[PDB]
Amino acid sequence: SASAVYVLDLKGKVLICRNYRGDVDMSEVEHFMPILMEKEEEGMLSPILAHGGVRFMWIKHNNLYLVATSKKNACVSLVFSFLYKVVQVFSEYFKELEEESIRDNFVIIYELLDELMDFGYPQTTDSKILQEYITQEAPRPPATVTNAVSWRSEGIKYRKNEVFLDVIEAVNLLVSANGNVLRSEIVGSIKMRVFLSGMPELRLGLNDKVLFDNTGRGKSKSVELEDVKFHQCVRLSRFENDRTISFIPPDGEFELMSYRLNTHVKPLIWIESVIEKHSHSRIEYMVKAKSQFKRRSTANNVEIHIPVPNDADSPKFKTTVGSVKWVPENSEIVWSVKSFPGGKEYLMRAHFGLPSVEAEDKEGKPPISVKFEIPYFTTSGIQVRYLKIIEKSGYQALPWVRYITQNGDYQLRTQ
Amino acid sequence: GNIFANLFKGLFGKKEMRILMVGLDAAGKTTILYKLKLGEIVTTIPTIGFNVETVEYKNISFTVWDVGGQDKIRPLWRHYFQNTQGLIFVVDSNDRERVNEAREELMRMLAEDELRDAVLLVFANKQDLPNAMNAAEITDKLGLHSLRHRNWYIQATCATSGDGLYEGLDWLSNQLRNQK
Amino acid sequence: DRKGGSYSQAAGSDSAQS
Amino acid sequence: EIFELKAELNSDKKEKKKEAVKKVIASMTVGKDVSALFPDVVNCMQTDNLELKKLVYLYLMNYAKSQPDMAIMAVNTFVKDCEDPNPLIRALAVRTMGCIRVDKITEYLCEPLRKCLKDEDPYVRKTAAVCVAKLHDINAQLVEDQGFLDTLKDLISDSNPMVVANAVAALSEIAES
Ligand SMILES: Nc1nc2c(ncn2[C@@H]2O[C@H](COP(=O)(O)OP(=O)(O)OP(=O)(O)O)[C@@H](O)[C@H]2O)c(=O)[nH]1
Ligand SMILES: [Mg+2]
């Protein structure tokens, strides 16, 4: 229940503001910057600010803080969801999130803000629906918003019905400094870019453990996702009733389902780090990486970031496979590898000097994270059964999907 | 410079002209404007704000800005006097009590230096009942002959019938346009 | 081709489930 | 600057009026007090272009509290726009009527609110519910006198499920206060 949502800037200048209820004066935004500065200087800065009896919730954007001032005890979750929807709409409409587009599309920005929500209650949130009624370069509102199916616009015609799926896998491993993995969770991502004619209703079917158990086929490799979140077009009633994933696919790229379950398997890459740091004399980087993934799978664009000393200089790298580059801005050496086949063993030997004068304050031990991304690999073993594409007119669809495995929160605790 | 484009535009008609809508409230000003623009007796609520429209006749687009005679809208008539070249006055021949108020409003409006080049245009409204005055009694009561340097013409127009609107429009066009 | 796994054709449903 | 903008706004050219409106909007967004030009833009309010109507409505909403006296010359325009055939225009007029923080403005908008309460368009129904909720928040006594509680309650048991949800949220907000 934010009184007014405004877009700020890095210098504190409000790029654009639009009051929704009028219960909060527009002058409260000026005091938001000093409050944020005081909180940052004292560590008390929070996204949800509080200017007396009015709370100015702000979200750190790419170039400006999306401050949404509120007066009463409005739904914080609802305000956050509205801000996220507005950010997504802006990203869809404007490819750049900076001050360049804030002052360049104000004429359409004001109309979009007015149409998005009224009296603090959001009304329009579909990017396609908003673009079909508000454009930067007006007819009556589309019937899709008024109709029940607000995620699949009717009347779409395409020469061919091709849908591109993406089996995105996020391998997050939390290995402590003792060598034991604490947080090992893999979050699935079923994103499909449906581009066909009409408004077909997708009939999702995969090798789900729950579905296999219900159908009596709970003996093969079935993916048991601890948390599965359906898309907006996905009907929750069918999923709750018999796990039937029946919903109208969106027009374009959309996230239908997102699996999320813990992983009890060994990490795809086993990295052993050695720190032979002398007392203000030299430093040793005994980094050894072992590929625990299948040999048939190669990790493309693997970048194992090893945090080097903050004041370290004149470093020498003695590695075997993969180029190592030290970035002064990042204050660490990333073990960049173009192609890393499964089972590969890369050994590195860092050697650099240190300044004679010791540091005045400690800098901490940031965890070592890798940027491995091996596609065409299904670590979870979940196999899609079929995709029920049904249209009233009747057409033969040719859906496509690719399985991509990448490294997410694969951070290794430093010694 | 060259005026070939201006001559070409004037050969087929380029002049538009302007007009204003003033008078007492419920004096047929909105009905008169609707008849001039559309041509039907359209029922409308009181003119809280103002009515803006344009009328095309004799190749001249004389825009008419109807203004109500309400107390809250009477002081707002000065806003529409800016960038205004014409003015049409709606009289209430059937409203004897409001006749004095309309005359006072017309005198106050005519006592402004800004509205000096606009010729007088009084429409004999309420021309549907026997109580309506003629084209001379209304003018005598309003004192149109005492308006020095003002070209005032008395025209009787009935909102229900629509007769006399053409005569008033022709008189206004003759007062504004003095060409062949 | 494309990095991250080549696109593969998908069926319409589980034909073995009737 | 100000004089040139006023002269451009007091002209009969659509391109010049649009340029003046864009300049005024840019000045207002940049932190320029354009409330003094609100009476000048009052005359250039009833325009056929939808882009200019939205800018005029936004300026009036942002210049309504600053110049409540100058806002009395927009009731007729709002009444005329409340019957626009385009659903977008009607929704914009309904939103602007409820967004105007004028005590004497909402009193004359009760009839348009009642007319738009039974709007067939789900977007129109949602806009009418939002305007009713805004009027109730601004004036609970006015909302009670207009009898919008019964209309809000009946909106829940109707079609336009997004409109039903908007009406339910409006009724909860009215009951919340
Ligand atoms: N029946 C009838 N009414 C007339 C006639 N001439 C003038 N009127 C009156 O003129 C009024 C026209 O009202 P509107 O259409 O709203 O325009 P208006 O004269 O400016 O009145 P306001 O909007 O209140 O300012 C009607 O209410 C009538 O009472 C006529 O010949 N016959
Ligand atoms: Mg009128």
* CATH top class, domain A269-375: mainly beta
CB atoms within 10 A of CB B124: 24
Q: Do D55 and A114 touch (CB under 8 A)?
A: no
From the list A114, A123, A139, which residue is nearest D166 (CB)? Answer: A123
**Contact between A265 and A169 (Cβ < 8 Å):** no
Cα B54 to the center of its chain, rounded Å: 13
Domain count, chain B: 1
Question: Contact D28/D34 with Cβ under 8 angstroms?
Answer: yes
User: Strand pairing of A298-306 and A368-370?
Assistant: antiparallel
Matching residue, tokens 């009476």: D39
* Cα separation of the two ends of chain A: 47
Alpha carbon A235 to its chain's center: 23
**Which stretches of chain B sit within 8 Å of chain D by CB?**
45, 47-52, 72, 76, 79-80, 82-83
Q: Using a threshold of 3 CB pairs under 8 A, tell whether chains A and D touch.
A: yes
> Could you tell me where the beta strands, DSSP code E, fall in A244-365?
245-247, 252-262, 269-272, 282-291, 298-306, 313-319, 323-327, 332-341, 345-353
Q: Which CATH number fits domain A4-131: 3.20.20.140, 1.20.140.10, 3.30.450.60, 2.30.30.30?
A: 3.30.450.60
Q: Using CA atoms, how far apart are residues A246 and D31, in angstroms rounded to an integer?
A: 51
Q: Can you tell me the distance from the alpha carbon of B155 to that of B173, in angstroms, rounded to the nearest whole number?
A: 14
Interface-testing mutation among B79, B81, B84, with chain D (most D C-beta atoms within 10 A): B79
The ligand with the least distance to the CA atom of B91 is: 1
Instruction: Give all strands of the β-sheet with A55-60 in edge-to-edge order.
Output: A16-19, A2-7, A65-70, A55-60
Distance from chain centroid for Cα B129: 21
Atom of ligand 1 nearest to the CA of B159: 31
Q: Name D90's Cβ contacts closer than 8 Å, sequence gap at least 6.
A: D81, D82, D83, D84, D116, D119, D121, D124, D127
What is the Å distance from ligand 2's center to D120 Cα? Answer: 29
Known binding residue B160? Answer is: no
What is the three-class DSSP state of A170?
strand
What distance in Å separates residue A398's CA from the closest CA in chain C?
A: 7
Q: Do chains D and B touch (3 or more CB pairs under 8 A)?
A: yes
Per residue in B70-105, is it b (16+ CB within 10 Å) or e — as a string? beebbebbebbbeebebbbbbbbbbbeebbebbbeb
Angle, CA D36 vertex, CA D30 and CA D41 arms, to 5°:
90
A:126-155 residues touching chain D, CB 8 A cutoff: 133, 138-141, 145-146, 148, 150
Say if residue B179 carries a ligand binding annotation.
no
> Which residues on chain A are in Cβ contact (under 8 Å) with C17?
215, 217
- The residues in A 176-205 lying below 8 A from C, measured between CB atoms, are 203, 205
Cα separation, A344 vs D84, in Å, equals 71
> A368-370 and A373-375: which strand pairing?
unpaired
Residues near ligand 1 (Cβ within 6 A): B 25-31, 44, 46-47, 68, 125-126, 128, 158-160
- B156 assigned ligand-binding residue: no
Please give the residue of chain D at the shortest CA–CA distance from A27.
D31
Q: Is B24 annotated as a binding residue?
A: yes
Q: Report the catalytic residues of B.
A: 70
**Distance, in angstroms, between A114 CA and closest chain C CA?**
41
The yes-or-no reply on C/A contact (3 CB pairs or more, < 8 Å) is yes
What tokens were used for A65?
């803080």
For residue B169, the enclosing domain spans 1-179
Q: Distance between CA A239 and CA A208 in Å, rounded?
A: 12
Q: Is B100 left (phi over 0), alpha (psi -120 to 50) or beta?
A: alpha
Elucidation technique: cryo-EM
Nearest CA in chain C to A389: C12
Contacts with D47 from chain B: Cβ below 8 Å: none
- Using CB atoms, pick whichever of B47, B79, B83 lies closest to residue D39: B79
Residue A199, token pair as written in the block: 């408004």
Own/partner pairs for A44-50, CB < 8 Å, 24+ apart? A48/A76
Residue A370 and residue A303: Cα distance in Å, rounded? 5
Q: With an 8 Å Cβ cutoff, is A294 touching chain C?
A: no
| Chain D residues touching B82 at Cβ < 8 A | 10, 43
- Say yes or no: A111 contacts chain D, CB-CB below 8 A: yes
For ligand 1, what atom is nearest to the CA of residue B73?
25
Q: Which two tokens stand for residue A399?
A: 């859906």
How many CB atoms neighbour CB B60 within 10 A? 19
The residue whose C-alpha atom lies closest to atom 29 belonging to ligand 1 is B26
Cβ–Cβ contact D72 with B under 8 A: yes
Which two structure tokens, joined as six digits, stand for A90?
């802006």
Which of B30, B48, B65 is the mutation pick for testing D, counting most D CBs within 10 A?
B48
Check residue D148 and report its DSSP letter.
Answer: H
